[PDB]
Amino acid sequence: TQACLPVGSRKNGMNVNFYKYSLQDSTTYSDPQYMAYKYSDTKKLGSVSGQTHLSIYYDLNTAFWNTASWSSDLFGFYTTPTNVTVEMTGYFLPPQTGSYTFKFATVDDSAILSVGGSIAFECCAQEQPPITSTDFTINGIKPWGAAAPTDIKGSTYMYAGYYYPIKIVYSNAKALARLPVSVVLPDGTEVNDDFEGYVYSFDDDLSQSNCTIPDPS
Numbered sequence: 001t002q003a004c005l006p007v008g009s010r011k012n013g014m015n016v017n018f019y020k021y022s023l024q025d026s027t028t029y030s031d032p033q034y035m036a037y038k039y040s041d042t043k044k045l046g047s048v049s050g051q052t053h054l055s056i057y058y059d060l061n062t063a064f065w066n067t068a069s070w071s072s073d074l075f076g077f078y079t080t081p082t083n084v085t086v087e088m089t090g091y092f093l094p095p096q097t098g099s100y101t102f103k104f105a106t107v108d109d110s111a112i113l114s115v116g117g118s119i120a121f122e123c124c125a126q127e128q129p130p131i132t133s134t135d136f137t138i139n140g141i142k143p144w145g146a147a148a149p150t151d152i153k154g155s156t157y158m159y160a161g162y163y164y165p166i167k168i169v170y171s172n173a174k175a176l177a178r179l180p181v182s183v184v185l186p187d188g189t190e191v192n193d194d195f196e197g198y199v200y201s202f203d204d205d206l207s208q209s210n211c212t213i214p215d216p217s
């Protein structure tokens with residue numbers, strides 16, 4: 001897996017961008033091209049930065065489930081979380097060399113995790129429009145109106161001390177939003193929801209020369 005060594009000032013946590021998703025659209029959220037990149041074909045609704053608590057939960061009254069609703073429940077950002085796509089980007093800093101098992105405990109309605117330079121995004125280009133890779137580490141999809149898969153896991157081998165691009169794209173098509181995010185470290189340590197000290201951001205520096213490490217090994 002391709003990693004990076006950005007030399008700018010490090011920022012804490014991951015950037016989160018918000019994009020429109022059509023209420024009750026039961027097709028788009030499950031299109032692989034949409035989850036990978038097409039979500040950015042609309043104007044960004046806005047963004048927040050510095051996020052370390054990655055897990056998503058929005059709920060509302062069952063009497064309202066066929067309807068849009070304004071709330072700040074997603075990352076403090078005022079939107080309609082009943083119907084929205086979220087892109088989280090940053091860099092993962094492995095404390096140790098080994099296999100890392102990322103997990104989505106379940107999902108509602110869809111989410112992907114991509115890991116690696118030229119997979120999640122290009123090294124030193126975190127803030128750019130999305131690249132087109134559908135080589136997902138995790139691809140979770142809730143069937144329309146039925147139970148979502150659980151313990152949806154994916155492994156990446158990482159070398160200590162390099163920064164690995166990560167991208168989570170998440171969509172809610174209606175009603176409840178759910179995405180519990182965790183990772184199991186090579187020592188068996190579980191990191192649940194709060195990724196402080198494991199995820200960082202760097203401002204784009206497309207001039208930096210030695211940013212990409214094709215083979216960290």
Ligand SMILES: OC[C@H]1O[C@H](O[C@H]2[C@@H](O)[C@H](O)[C@@H](CO)O[C@@H]2O)[C@@H](O)[C@@H](O)[C@@H]1O
Nearest residue numbers: 108109143144145146147173174175176
């Ligand atoms: O019983 C259907 C469904 O209800 C709830 O999920 C809702 C919503 O969040 C989903 O996006 C859509 C489409 O799958 O279904 C519901 O409106 C949850 O109770 C869920 O567990 C369940 O399958």
Ligand SMILES: [Ca+2]
Nearest residue numbers: 108174175176
């Ligand atoms: Ca939903």
